[PDB]
Amino acid sequence: KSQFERAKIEYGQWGIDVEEALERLKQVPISIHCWQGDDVGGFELSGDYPGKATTPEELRMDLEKALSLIPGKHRVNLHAIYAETDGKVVERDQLEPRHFEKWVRWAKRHGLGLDFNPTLFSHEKAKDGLTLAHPDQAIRQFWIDHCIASRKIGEYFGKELETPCLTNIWIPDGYKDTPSDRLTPRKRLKESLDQIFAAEINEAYNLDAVESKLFGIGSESYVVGSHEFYLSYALKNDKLCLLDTGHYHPTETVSNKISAMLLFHDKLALHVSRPVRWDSDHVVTFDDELREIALEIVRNDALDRVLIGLDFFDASINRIAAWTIGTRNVIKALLFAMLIPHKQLKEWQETGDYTRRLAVLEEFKTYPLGAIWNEYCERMNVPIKEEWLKEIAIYEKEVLLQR
Amino acid sequence: KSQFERAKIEYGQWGIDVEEALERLKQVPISIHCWQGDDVGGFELDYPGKATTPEELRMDLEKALSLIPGKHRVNLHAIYAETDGKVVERDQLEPRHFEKWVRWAKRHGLGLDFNPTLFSHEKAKDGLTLAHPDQAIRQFWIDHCIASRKIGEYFGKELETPCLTNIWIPDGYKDTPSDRLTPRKRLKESLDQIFAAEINEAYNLDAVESKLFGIGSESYVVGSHEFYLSYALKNDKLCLLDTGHYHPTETVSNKISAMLLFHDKLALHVSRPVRWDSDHVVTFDDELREIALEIVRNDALDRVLIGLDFFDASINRIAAWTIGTRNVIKALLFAMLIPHKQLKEWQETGDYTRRLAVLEEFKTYPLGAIWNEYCERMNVPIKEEWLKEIAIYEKEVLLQR
Ligand SMILES: [Mn+2]
Ligand SMILES: [Mn+2]
Ligand SMILES: [Mn+2]
Ligand SMILES: [Mn+2]
């Protein structure tokens, strides 16, 4: 109120225009993933926290509860196993725009954008833990086909919703133990991708992303689609790199990659999740790396160029909370990065005044961000501070515990 | 030796042709670095008997080469110019300053690889170089790098084997930076300039080398992995992968096959990192073997330009080159003697059991016997006998300095 007004001049002494940051913050959309809501079940025909969603309509209502507690206007990220086959078995190579018709009517209803993923796991045709890179041509051909279907589905979304859909390819391909050939399976991956992307699609409707991973449970020794593979591949073929913050080496940092991608790519894509010693997929927290990512997005004038998304899955807590704690933190960090004096911070590093650059970065860690954040929440009709938690408790009592 | 002959039979049982491997191995050159010899001192205007002159450095190089089987290459740094009387600025370096290097190389059947020197200099005092905010600095280093590209050219013309000019810069910041992008933009502008004039690839090839961090550069490094990997991809240059230069538990091994899909050629420095880019003499370890396997089994023996990059001053410096280069040849050898065909086929077919047993069993196959034969056909001392040469040499020459 005036708690907010005194906070406002503290930033104004630096020439930081907070009113302006709040307009700019209003418009950045976070793509939130639907898989959190039903523990990555999907709707495919053929001891955790209670109350997950188990039907398409339960999942939608849940997405709305979370959105109603998160400020701004955002997007929903779908997986192909979220198809509504209408009680028919439809093979993955056969999924079609009319299978996601309900999702699109619902997105249009709420002003959501929509993003997409082919699903290449939990399937008969993926038991050997190889896929687009399986030695068999009929397996490889099945998954190529499905990725081509998803490309069409994504175009569908962009067509219908008037906003580019990002279709991202992730594969689980690898070997648990030491490989005796690293070159051939990657070669097949290249061929499998050359095919998947054979046909142009208007960039206004769809964009293609590839996401690497360093290792999985069951692919601990070697993953086919690696950081260097997808980097070279994306650059050569004008695709987007999707970076997941849980997908790298120990100590390995995504914030250090962003400025280097920005030099050779018009756009890139982000999945923010929290790794605790593996791609554990913990809920995102307002931590140093999260802020350091935000810093890079803002300093580098990259808000139209970094497509921000969430990737996490905690079933040990309330799932609607996961979504809300996740997104609020990533918004907080953008806000924080928006409230940094980059102009003087940058001149100090140009001039080598490392003393002030250290001093002031340090001192902004206690600048009154809560006060700005709180007001932003109030203007955007969501609960300030820990209040959103009352709303999850009602919803858990009335709705979620009844399932 | 019959001993060899029994070994030969054990490998042949799998279909592996030892004699063919030996003839293959003899063919591969390893780029040996000069800076081991004088502690990266250079000639520009701790264990005793490091070299203090070009002739000493050469004698030492010769002695080392005579304890290593094969016919190899030498890697020079710009600070190793022979400038006769004068002081020459690094932006004024010309081929005439490496004439004596080339005359010696040709005589000895060696190739010469090359590196501009972007460190220990007034103009690199701030720890930025090509990405310095100041034009005059960047400009000066651009010229040095351009001057170096011509010297690589001169080398390759003179030695009828292409020269690898590698660029490595120290640029980064000690503590958390407030702009990670524009220094990288400046490096980009800079290399564009450096590579602007075209040189024939029969004489010279350009490479670029990233690093994660260095002392005084812990927090951020302008020339990062992603940066150079993108750059060499846009402008048809080489990536140089230094095994000492990546995150904890990150292997260069896993990168080789990803990269071969997209570049004709690729360069490596091998050196042992012990918890940082510490540049320890190369050992015959897990990582080395996994690297060797990757080159041999991917057919990249002509596509991967192998070099050394360590600096250990706590032991005999001749010994350093020889242990080091001998393990990288040892490891290539071991990789040629592995039954890839049936191993590839077991993985293709599901039999991961046989894949594991057999990689494992080959860890006891009789490598030594073959290696020993190889050293004798190549007229270098076998096993440890090479210490004696070293010890005679330490006395007669090393210690009268
Ligand atoms: Mn992901
Ligand atoms: Mn993940
Ligand atoms: Mn190196
Ligand atoms: Mn190193």
Swiss-Prot record, chain B:
EC identifiers of the protein: 5.3.1.14
One example of a Gene Ontology biological process annotation: rhamnose catabolic process
Pathway: Carbohydrate degradation; L-rhamnose degradation; glycerone phosphate from L-rhamnose: step 1/3
Keyword Isomerase: yes
Protein residues bound to Mn(2+): 245, 277, 279
Keyword Manganese on entry: yes
Keyword line: Cytoplasm, Isomerase, Manganese, Metal-binding, Rhamnose metabolism
Bridged cysteine pairs (disulfide): none
A single MF term (Gene Ontology): manganese ion binding
GO cellular component: cytoplasm
Coiled-coil regions, chain positions: none
Recorded catalytic activity of this chain's protein: L-rhamnopyranose = L-rhamnulose
Subcellular location: Cytoplasm
Cofactor binding annotation: Binds 1 Mn(2+) ion per subunit.
Family annotation (InterPro entries): L-rhamnose_isomerase, Rhamnose_isomerase, Xyl_isomerase-like_sf
Cofactor(s), names only, from the UniProt record: Mn(2+)
Function field: Catalyzes the interconversion of L-rhamnose and L-rhamnulose.
Protein family: Belongs to the rhamnose isomerase family.
The protein's name: L-rhamnose isomerase
Organism per entry: Halalkalibacterium halodurans (strain ATCC BAA-125 / DSM 18197 / FERM 7344 / JCM 9153 / C-125)
